[PDB]
Amino acid sequence: EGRTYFESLCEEEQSLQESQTHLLNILDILSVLADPRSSDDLLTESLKKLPDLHRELINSSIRLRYDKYQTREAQLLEDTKTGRDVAAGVQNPKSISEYYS
Amino acid sequence: MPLSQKQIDQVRTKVHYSEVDTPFNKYLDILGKVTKLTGSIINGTLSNDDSKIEKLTEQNISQLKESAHLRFLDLQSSIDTKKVADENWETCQQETLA
Amino acid sequence: MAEQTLLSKLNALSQKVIPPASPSQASILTEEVIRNWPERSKTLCSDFTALESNDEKEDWLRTLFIELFDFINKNDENSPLKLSDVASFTNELVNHERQVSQASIVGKMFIAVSSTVPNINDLTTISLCKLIPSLHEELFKFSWISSKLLNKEQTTLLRH
């Protein structure tokens, strides 16, 4: 269906926030792998959470790219409409054709 | 060395859909840098090689955490900037038509 | 530094998960019992035309295109060559999409997944997209494997 540039751009920011949360959840697991005074049990528990987040990050970075393409085709679709098509909505031709005359 | 009619309209289209976008292409550098990093730790390779981003740090991995949060705000502010610039052009197009 | 290097390695292979056979099965369970590459191609294209939910049809589109790029990664599992017969299956999807609707959802999800999954080899990717004839319109609008798909003369029309 036909989407607008404004609606397709605001939907990109929704899919951007989902990619941020999985990114921050992975990055703290790499931090607790790098603690100097780290404990024996936290380095076993954190690694079990790792493959479930990894294939979830790819499914969010793919939908981010897919909505970068759908806004690009909606951007160019609105530029070809500009010009004499926007002013084909007035219903007072006799008032302007005597004002310019 | 001739060309075709199909071969001309295939380069007439690649130019028309070519964008350079510095805030967006810098964010995907961070998303790409972690998937290749958590790819190798699943397999088991972790060595003192400089082909990847880094091996194991407290400061420099948190420097990647800062880079993941800085470029997110640069991308978020740029989408907001394209939002308000599209709203303003629609208003002046309507008040001129008024 | 070498002790914290190696201590994470002992917990790496041993106790996290099993080697991936069971958690990664989307629609391709095996290749010996359900090999069926003509027979699978008839029932899968009819599955796509019975889909109206646009989000979960792309949740289905991405979950096949990850494992298809992961299938061609490993070599000699059943065959030394597998990249030839997969191009006939994706090509009839685009021509079936172009009948009912006017979009590039199979095309745009081919571009998005190929530039994301970070374990495939660079040389095997371009060799299969050269053979697929109907995704040439969306490959030129989008990602960087249109650089090696172009001529040596035709870049002098692009650079100008």
Side-chain angles (χ1 to χ4, degrees), chain C residues 102-142:
Chain C
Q102 319 168 58
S104 316
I105 312 176
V106 193
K108 292 176 186 148
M109 288 306 296
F110 189 62
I111 302 151
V113 178
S114 44
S115 42
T116 312
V117 192
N119 39 306
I120 62 190
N121 180 57
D122 46 355
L123 299 108
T124 176
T125 49
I126 178 58
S127 43
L128 66 95
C129 314
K130 187 74 72 67
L131 196 148
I132 311 169
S134 177
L135 289 194
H136 272 244
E137 284 79 5
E138 311 311 283
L139 270 169
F140 286 160
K141 302 187 193 184
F142 298 120

mmCIF file of all heavy atoms in Angstrom, chain C residues 102-142:
data_model
loop_
_atom_site.group_PDB
_atom_site.id
_atom_site.type_symbol
_atom_site.label_atom_id
_atom_site.label_comp_id
_atom_site.label_asym_id
_atom_site.label_seq_id
_atom_site.Cartn_x
_atom_site.Cartn_y
_atom_site.Cartn_z
ATOM 1 N N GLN C 102 3.162 -4.809 -6.666
ATOM 2 C CA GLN C 102 4.274 -4.077 -7.273
ATOM 3 C C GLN C 102 5.199 -3.625 -6.148
ATOM 4 O O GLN C 102 5.100 -2.493 -5.665
ATOM 5 C CB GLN C 102 3.779 -2.890 -8.094
ATOM 6 C CG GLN C 102 2.546 -3.165 -8.926
ATOM 7 C CD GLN C 102 1.941 -1.898 -9.479
ATOM 8 O OE1 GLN C 102 2.600 -1.142 -10.192
ATOM 9 N NE2 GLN C 102 0.681 -1.651 -9.145
ATOM 10 N N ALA C 103 6.103 -4.506 -5.741
ATOM 11 C CA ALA C 103 7.087 -4.182 -4.720
ATOM 12 C C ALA C 103 8.311 -5.048 -4.964
ATOM 13 O O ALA C 103 8.364 -5.828 -5.919
ATOM 14 C CB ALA C 103 6.523 -4.388 -3.312
ATOM 15 N N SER C 104 9.293 -4.917 -4.085
ATOM 16 C CA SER C 104 10.533 -5.669 -4.185
ATOM 17 C C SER C 104 10.867 -6.300 -2.849
ATOM 18 O O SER C 104 12.010 -6.276 -2.393
ATOM 19 C CB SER C 104 11.670 -4.774 -4.658
ATOM 20 O OG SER C 104 11.252 -3.954 -5.734
ATOM 21 N N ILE C 105 9.848 -6.880 -2.208
ATOM 22 C CA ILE C 105 10.004 -7.407 -0.856
ATOM 23 C C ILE C 105 10.919 -8.624 -0.854
ATOM 24 O O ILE C 105 11.701 -8.824 0.078
ATOM 25 C CB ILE C 105 8.625 -7.722 -0.250
ATOM 26 C CG1 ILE C 105 7.680 -6.544 -0.472
ATOM 27 C CG2 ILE C 105 8.740 -8.020 1.234
ATOM 28 C CD1 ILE C 105 6.272 -6.797 0.009
ATOM 29 N N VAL C 106 10.869 -9.432 -1.914
ATOM 30 C CA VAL C 106 11.852 -10.503 -2.050
ATOM 31 C C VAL C 106 13.209 -9.925 -2.429
ATOM 32 O O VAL C 106 14.258 -10.435 -2.016
ATOM 33 C CB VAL C 106 11.368 -11.554 -3.064
ATOM 34 C CG1 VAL C 106 12.218 -12.809 -2.973
ATOM 35 C CG2 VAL C 106 9.924 -11.897 -2.797
ATOM 36 N N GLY C 107 13.208 -8.838 -3.202
ATOM 37 C CA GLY C 107 14.465 -8.217 -3.584
ATOM 38 C C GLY C 107 15.138 -7.501 -2.429
ATOM 39 O O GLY C 107 16.332 -7.682 -2.184
ATOM 40 N N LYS C 108 14.371 -6.689 -1.692
ATOM 41 C CA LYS C 108 14.942 -5.902 -0.602
ATOM 42 C C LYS C 108 15.361 -6.784 0.565
ATOM 43 O O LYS C 108 16.281 -6.436 1.312
ATOM 44 C CB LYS C 108 13.940 -4.850 -0.132
ATOM 45 C CG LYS C 108 13.666 -3.760 -1.144
ATOM 46 C CD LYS C 108 12.599 -2.819 -0.636
ATOM 47 C CE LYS C 108 12.203 -1.819 -1.692
ATOM 48 N NZ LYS C 108 10.775 -1.433 -1.554
ATOM 49 N N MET C 109 14.700 -7.930 0.741
ATOM 50 C CA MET C 109 15.129 -8.855 1.783
ATOM 51 C C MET C 109 16.275 -9.731 1.300
ATOM 52 O O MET C 109 16.939 -10.388 2.105
ATOM 53 C CB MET C 109 13.962 -9.716 2.256
ATOM 54 C CG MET C 109 12.936 -8.974 3.087
ATOM 55 S SD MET C 109 13.674 -8.143 4.493
ATOM 56 C CE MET C 109 14.281 -9.555 5.390
ATOM 57 N N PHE C 110 16.524 -9.762 -0.007
ATOM 58 C CA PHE C 110 17.733 -10.422 -0.483
ATOM 59 C C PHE C 110 18.951 -9.540 -0.261
ATOM 60 O O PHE C 110 20.043 -10.036 0.032
ATOM 61 C CB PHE C 110 17.606 -10.785 -1.960
ATOM 62 C CG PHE C 110 18.715 -11.661 -2.452
ATOM 63 C CD1 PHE C 110 18.908 -12.922 -1.913
ATOM 64 C CD2 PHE C 110 19.588 -11.209 -3.426
ATOM 65 C CE1 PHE C 110 19.937 -13.729 -2.354
ATOM 66 C CE2 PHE C 110 20.617 -12.009 -3.872
ATOM 67 C CZ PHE C 110 20.793 -13.271 -3.335
ATOM 68 N N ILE C 111 18.778 -8.225 -0.399
ATOM 69 C CA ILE C 111 19.881 -7.294 -0.202
ATOM 70 C C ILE C 111 20.189 -7.136 1.281
ATOM 71 O O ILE C 111 21.357 -7.061 1.686
ATOM 72 C CB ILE C 111 19.540 -5.947 -0.861
ATOM 73 C CG1 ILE C 111 19.258 -6.136 -2.343
ATOM 74 C CG2 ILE C 111 20.664 -4.964 -0.701
ATOM 75 C CD1 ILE C 111 18.299 -5.121 -2.890
ATOM 76 N N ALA C 112 19.145 -7.105 2.116
ATOM 77 C CA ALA C 112 19.322 -6.809 3.532
ATOM 78 C C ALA C 112 19.991 -7.960 4.267
ATOM 79 O O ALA C 112 20.794 -7.739 5.177
ATOM 80 C CB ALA C 112 17.974 -6.483 4.169
ATOM 81 N N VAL C 113 19.685 -9.198 3.878
ATOM 82 C CA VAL C 113 20.223 -10.346 4.601
ATOM 83 C C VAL C 113 21.637 -10.666 4.125
ATOM 84 O O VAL C 113 22.497 -11.066 4.921
ATOM 85 C CB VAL C 113 19.261 -11.541 4.463
ATOM 86 C CG1 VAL C 113 19.797 -12.771 5.157
ATOM 87 C CG2 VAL C 113 17.925 -11.187 5.079
ATOM 88 N N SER C 114 21.921 -10.438 2.839
ATOM 89 C CA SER C 114 23.236 -10.757 2.287
ATOM 90 C C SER C 114 24.330 -9.855 2.840
ATOM 91 O O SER C 114 25.485 -10.282 2.949
ATOM 92 C CB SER C 114 23.201 -10.651 0.767
ATOM 93 O OG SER C 114 22.499 -9.488 0.366
ATOM 94 N N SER C 115 23.994 -8.615 3.191
ATOM 95 C CA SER C 115 24.974 -7.698 3.754
ATOM 96 C C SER C 115 24.990 -7.707 5.275
ATOM 97 O O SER C 115 25.601 -6.817 5.874
ATOM 98 C CB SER C 115 24.709 -6.279 3.252
ATOM 99 O OG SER C 115 23.323 -5.997 3.260
ATOM 100 N N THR C 116 24.336 -8.679 5.913
ATOM 101 C CA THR C 116 24.239 -8.667 7.369
ATOM 102 C C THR C 116 24.936 -9.866 8.006
ATOM 103 O O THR C 116 25.692 -9.709 8.971
ATOM 104 C CB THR C 116 22.775 -8.617 7.795
ATOM 105 O OG1 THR C 116 22.104 -7.590 7.063
ATOM 106 C CG2 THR C 116 22.679 -8.306 9.269
ATOM 107 N N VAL C 117 24.690 -11.067 7.487
ATOM 108 C CA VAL C 117 25.099 -12.313 8.137
ATOM 109 C C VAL C 117 26.612 -12.485 8.039
ATOM 110 O O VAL C 117 27.136 -12.809 6.964
ATOM 111 C CB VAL C 117 24.357 -13.515 7.536
ATOM 112 C CG1 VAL C 117 24.552 -14.736 8.403
ATOM 113 C CG2 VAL C 117 22.883 -13.205 7.407
ATOM 114 N N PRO C 118 27.347 -12.275 9.142
ATOM 115 C CA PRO C 118 28.799 -12.067 9.084
ATOM 116 C C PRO C 118 29.642 -13.331 9.244
ATOM 117 O O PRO C 118 30.587 -13.377 10.040
ATOM 118 C CB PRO C 118 29.035 -11.102 10.251
ATOM 119 C CG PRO C 118 27.905 -11.452 11.252
ATOM 120 C CD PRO C 118 26.888 -12.326 10.536
ATOM 121 N N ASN C 119 29.313 -14.375 8.489
ATOM 122 C CA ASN C 119 30.165 -15.559 8.492
ATOM 123 C C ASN C 119 30.288 -16.141 7.092
ATOM 124 O O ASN C 119 31.021 -17.111 6.877
ATOM 125 C CB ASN C 119 29.645 -16.609 9.478
ATOM 126 C CG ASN C 119 28.139 -16.712 9.480
ATOM 127 O OD1 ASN C 119 27.442 -15.715 9.656
ATOM 128 N ND2 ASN C 119 27.626 -17.922 9.296
ATOM 129 N N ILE C 120 29.575 -15.552 6.135
ATOM 130 C CA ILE C 120 29.670 -16.002 4.755
ATOM 131 C C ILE C 120 30.964 -15.491 4.132
ATOM 132 O O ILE C 120 31.595 -14.547 4.629
ATOM 133 C CB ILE C 120 28.440 -15.538 3.956
ATOM 134 C CG1 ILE C 120 28.371 -14.008 3.929
ATOM 135 C CG2 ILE C 120 27.175 -16.144 4.549
ATOM 136 C CD1 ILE C 120 27.072 -13.451 3.383
ATOM 137 N N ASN C 121 31.373 -16.129 3.039
ATOM 138 C CA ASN C 121 32.580 -15.731 2.331
ATOM 139 C C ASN C 121 32.228 -14.684 1.279
ATOM 140 O O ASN C 121 31.112 -14.669 0.753
ATOM 141 C CB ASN C 121 33.239 -16.957 1.691
ATOM 142 C CG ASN C 121 34.509 -16.623 0.935
ATOM 143 O OD1 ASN C 121 35.451 -16.066 1.497
ATOM 144 N ND2 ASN C 121 34.543 -16.967 -0.345
ATOM 145 N N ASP C 122 33.170 -13.781 1.004
ATOM 146 C CA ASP C 122 32.891 -12.679 0.089
ATOM 147 C C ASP C 122 32.786 -13.148 -1.360
ATOM 148 O O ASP C 122 31.977 -12.613 -2.127
ATOM 149 C CB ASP C 122 33.956 -11.593 0.238
ATOM 150 C CG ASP C 122 35.358 -12.153 0.270
ATOM 151 O OD1 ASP C 122 35.496 -13.390 0.279
ATOM 152 O OD2 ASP C 122 36.319 -11.359 0.309
ATOM 153 N N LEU C 123 33.582 -14.147 -1.756
ATOM 154 C CA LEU C 123 33.634 -14.520 -3.169
ATOM 155 C C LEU C 123 32.416 -15.336 -3.588
ATOM 156 O O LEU C 123 32.008 -15.293 -4.755
ATOM 157 C CB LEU C 123 34.917 -15.295 -3.476
ATOM 158 C CG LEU C 123 36.266 -14.605 -3.256
ATOM 159 C CD1 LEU C 123 36.996 -15.175 -2.050
ATOM 160 C CD2 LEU C 123 37.131 -14.713 -4.498
ATOM 161 N N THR C 124 31.815 -16.080 -2.657
ATOM 162 C CA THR C 124 30.701 -16.947 -3.034
ATOM 163 C C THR C 124 29.401 -16.163 -3.167
ATOM 164 O O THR C 124 28.443 -16.637 -3.787
ATOM 165 C CB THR C 124 30.538 -18.086 -2.028
ATOM 166 O OG1 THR C 124 29.381 -18.855 -2.374
ATOM 167 C CG2 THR C 124 30.373 -17.551 -0.623
ATOM 168 N N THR C 125 29.351 -14.961 -2.589
ATOM 169 C CA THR C 125 28.129 -14.163 -2.622
ATOM 170 C C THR C 125 27.870 -13.593 -4.007
ATOM 171 O O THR C 125 26.744 -13.663 -4.511
ATOM 172 C CB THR C 125 28.217 -13.031 -1.602
ATOM 173 O OG1 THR C 125 29.464 -12.341 -1.761
ATOM 174 C CG2 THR C 125 28.120 -13.572 -0.191
ATOM 175 N N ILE C 126 28.901 -13.023 -4.633
ATOM 176 C CA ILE C 126 28.732 -12.348 -5.917
ATOM 177 C C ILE C 126 28.483 -13.366 -7.028
ATOM 178 O O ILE C 126 27.777 -13.082 -8.006
ATOM 179 C CB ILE C 126 29.961 -11.452 -6.189
ATOM 180 C CG1 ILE C 126 29.881 -10.740 -7.544
ATOM 181 C CG2 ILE C 126 31.260 -12.241 -6.044
ATOM 182 C CD1 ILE C 126 28.661 -9.866 -7.703
ATOM 183 N N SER C 127 28.995 -14.589 -6.858
ATOM 184 C CA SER C 127 28.902 -15.604 -7.904
ATOM 185 C C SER C 127 27.482 -16.132 -8.082
ATOM 186 O O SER C 127 27.138 -16.621 -9.164
ATOM 187 C CB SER C 127 29.858 -16.755 -7.595
ATOM 188 O OG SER C 127 29.798 -17.106 -6.225
ATOM 189 N N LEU C 128 26.647 -16.050 -7.045
ATOM 190 C CA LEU C 128 25.286 -16.559 -7.177
ATOM 191 C C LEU C 128 24.324 -15.472 -7.640
ATOM 192 O O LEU C 128 23.345 -15.766 -8.333
ATOM 193 C CB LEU C 128 24.829 -17.184 -5.853
ATOM 194 C CG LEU C 128 24.626 -16.363 -4.575
ATOM 195 C CD1 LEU C 128 23.172 -15.943 -4.394
ATOM 196 C CD2 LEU C 128 25.115 -17.121 -3.360
ATOM 197 N N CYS C 129 24.585 -14.212 -7.275
ATOM 198 C CA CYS C 129 23.722 -13.121 -7.719
ATOM 199 C C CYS C 129 23.935 -12.775 -9.184
ATOM 200 O O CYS C 129 23.073 -12.123 -9.783
ATOM 201 C CB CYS C 129 23.940 -11.874 -6.864
ATOM 202 S SG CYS C 129 23.985 -12.163 -5.084
ATOM 203 N N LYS C 130 25.065 -13.187 -9.762
ATOM 204 C CA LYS C 130 25.295 -13.043 -11.194
ATOM 205 C C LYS C 130 24.324 -13.886 -12.012
ATOM 206 O O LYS C 130 23.967 -13.499 -13.130
ATOM 207 C CB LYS C 130 26.742 -13.432 -11.515
ATOM 208 C CG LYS C 130 27.198 -13.177 -12.944
ATOM 209 C CD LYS C 130 27.429 -11.702 -13.218
ATOM 210 C CE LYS C 130 28.686 -11.208 -12.516
ATOM 211 N NZ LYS C 130 29.927 -11.808 -13.074
ATOM 212 N N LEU C 131 23.863 -15.009 -11.461
ATOM 213 C CA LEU C 131 23.059 -15.948 -12.235
ATOM 214 C C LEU C 131 21.573 -15.616 -12.135
ATOM 215 O O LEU C 131 20.800 -15.917 -13.052
ATOM 216 C CB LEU C 131 23.354 -17.372 -11.757
ATOM 217 C CG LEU C 131 22.952 -18.598 -12.576
ATOM 218 C CD1 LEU C 131 23.972 -19.691 -12.334
ATOM 219 C CD2 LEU C 131 21.570 -19.103 -12.214
ATOM 220 N N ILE C 132 21.153 -15.004 -11.031
ATOM 221 C CA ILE C 132 19.753 -14.635 -10.815
ATOM 222 C C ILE C 132 19.407 -13.449 -11.710
ATOM 223 O O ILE C 132 19.983 -12.366 -11.549
ATOM 224 C CB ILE C 132 19.480 -14.309 -9.337
ATOM 225 C CG1 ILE C 132 20.049 -15.403 -8.434
ATOM 226 C CG2 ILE C 132 17.989 -14.151 -9.096
ATOM 227 C CD1 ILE C 132 20.058 -15.046 -6.967
ATOM 228 N N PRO C 133 18.478 -13.603 -12.660
ATOM 229 C CA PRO C 133 18.302 -12.565 -13.685
ATOM 230 C C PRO C 133 17.285 -11.484 -13.358
ATOM 231 O O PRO C 133 17.316 -10.430 -14.008
ATOM 232 C CB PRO C 133 17.849 -13.372 -14.905
ATOM 233 C CG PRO C 133 17.045 -14.485 -14.299
ATOM 234 C CD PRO C 133 17.657 -14.793 -12.941
ATOM 235 N N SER C 134 16.384 -11.691 -12.402
ATOM 236 C CA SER C 134 15.292 -10.747 -12.190
ATOM 237 C C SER C 134 15.535 -9.792 -11.030
ATOM 238 O O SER C 134 14.759 -8.848 -10.854
ATOM 239 C CB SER C 134 13.980 -11.498 -11.960
ATOM 240 O OG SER C 134 12.926 -10.591 -11.685
ATOM 241 N N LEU C 135 16.585 -10.003 -10.243
ATOM 242 C CA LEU C 135 16.945 -9.093 -9.165
ATOM 243 C C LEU C 135 18.003 -8.086 -9.586
ATOM 244 O O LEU C 135 18.700 -7.540 -8.728
ATOM 245 C CB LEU C 135 17.429 -9.880 -7.948
ATOM 246 C CG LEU C 135 16.359 -10.652 -7.178
ATOM 247 C CD1 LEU C 135 16.905 -11.091 -5.843
ATOM 248 C CD2 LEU C 135 15.114 -9.808 -6.981
ATOM 249 N N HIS C 136 18.139 -7.829 -10.885
ATOM 250 C CA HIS C 136 19.147 -6.886 -11.355
ATOM 251 C C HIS C 136 18.657 -5.452 -11.207
ATOM 252 O O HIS C 136 19.453 -4.510 -11.148
ATOM 253 C CB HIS C 136 19.509 -7.197 -12.805
ATOM 254 C CG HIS C 136 20.605 -8.205 -12.944
ATOM 255 N ND1 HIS C 136 21.825 -7.906 -13.506
ATOM 256 C CD2 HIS C 136 20.667 -9.504 -12.575
ATOM 257 C CE1 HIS C 136 22.591 -8.983 -13.487
ATOM 258 N NE2 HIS C 136 21.912 -9.966 -12.924
ATOM 259 N N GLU C 137 17.339 -5.268 -11.154
ATOM 260 C CA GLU C 137 16.788 -3.928 -10.994
ATOM 261 C C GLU C 137 16.926 -3.425 -9.565
ATOM 262 O O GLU C 137 17.032 -2.215 -9.344
ATOM 263 C CB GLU C 137 15.322 -3.916 -11.433
ATOM 264 C CG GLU C 137 15.124 -3.922 -12.946
ATOM 265 C CD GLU C 137 15.288 -5.299 -13.580
ATOM 266 O OE1 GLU C 137 15.468 -6.293 -12.843
ATOM 267 O OE2 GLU C 137 15.243 -5.383 -14.825
ATOM 268 N N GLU C 138 16.925 -4.327 -8.583
ATOM 269 C CA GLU C 138 17.029 -3.894 -7.194
ATOM 270 C C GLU C 138 18.462 -3.989 -6.694
ATOM 271 O O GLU C 138 18.814 -3.387 -5.678
ATOM 272 C CB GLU C 138 16.099 -4.718 -6.308
ATOM 273 C CG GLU C 138 14.684 -4.836 -6.829
ATOM 274 C CD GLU C 138 14.089 -3.503 -7.228
ATOM 275 O OE1 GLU C 138 13.694 -2.735 -6.329
ATOM 276 O OE2 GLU C 138 14.000 -3.228 -8.444
ATOM 277 N N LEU C 139 19.303 -4.753 -7.388
ATOM 278 C CA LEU C 139 20.709 -4.788 -7.008
ATOM 279 C C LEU C 139 21.424 -3.509 -7.410
ATOM 280 O O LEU C 139 22.408 -3.125 -6.772
ATOM 281 C CB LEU C 139 21.404 -5.992 -7.634
ATOM 282 C CG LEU C 139 21.387 -7.264 -6.794
ATOM 283 C CD1 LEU C 139 21.857 -8.438 -7.622
ATOM 284 C CD2 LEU C 139 22.251 -7.090 -5.568
ATOM 285 N N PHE C 140 20.945 -2.835 -8.454
ATOM 286 C CA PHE C 140 21.615 -1.623 -8.904
ATOM 287 C C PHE C 140 21.233 -0.432 -8.039
ATOM 288 O O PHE C 140 22.064 0.446 -7.780
ATOM 289 C CB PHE C 140 21.297 -1.365 -10.376
ATOM 290 C CG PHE C 140 22.021 -2.287 -11.315
ATOM 291 C CD1 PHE C 140 21.574 -2.482 -12.606
ATOM 292 C CD2 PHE C 140 23.148 -2.970 -10.897
ATOM 293 C CE1 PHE C 140 22.244 -3.338 -13.455
ATOM 294 C CE2 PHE C 140 23.822 -3.818 -11.741
ATOM 295 C CZ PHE C 140 23.369 -4.004 -13.023
ATOM 296 N N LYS C 141 19.989 -0.392 -7.562
ATOM 297 C CA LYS C 141 19.542 0.647 -6.643
ATOM 298 C C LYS C 141 20.202 0.568 -5.272
ATOM 299 O O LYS C 141 20.191 1.565 -4.547
ATOM 300 C CB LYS C 141 18.029 0.576 -6.457
ATOM 301 C CG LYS C 141 17.219 0.709 -7.718
ATOM 302 C CD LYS C 141 15.747 0.803 -7.377
ATOM 303 C CE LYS C 141 14.879 0.624 -8.600
ATOM 304 N NZ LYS C 141 13.437 0.800 -8.285
ATOM 305 N N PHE C 142 20.788 -0.565 -4.909
ATOM 306 C CA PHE C 142 21.160 -0.862 -3.530
ATOM 307 C C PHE C 142 22.538 -1.520 -3.552
ATOM 308 O O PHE C 142 23.307 -1.341 -4.502
ATOM 309 C CB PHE C 142 20.057 -1.681 -2.847
ATOM 310 C CG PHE C 142 18.745 -0.951 -2.755
ATOM 311 C CD1 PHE C 142 17.605 -1.456 -3.354
ATOM 312 C CD2 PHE C 142 18.664 0.262 -2.098
ATOM 313 C CE1 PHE C 142 16.403 -0.771 -3.281
ATOM 314 C CE2 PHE C 142 17.469 0.950 -2.024
ATOM 315 C CZ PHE C 142 16.340 0.432 -2.615
#
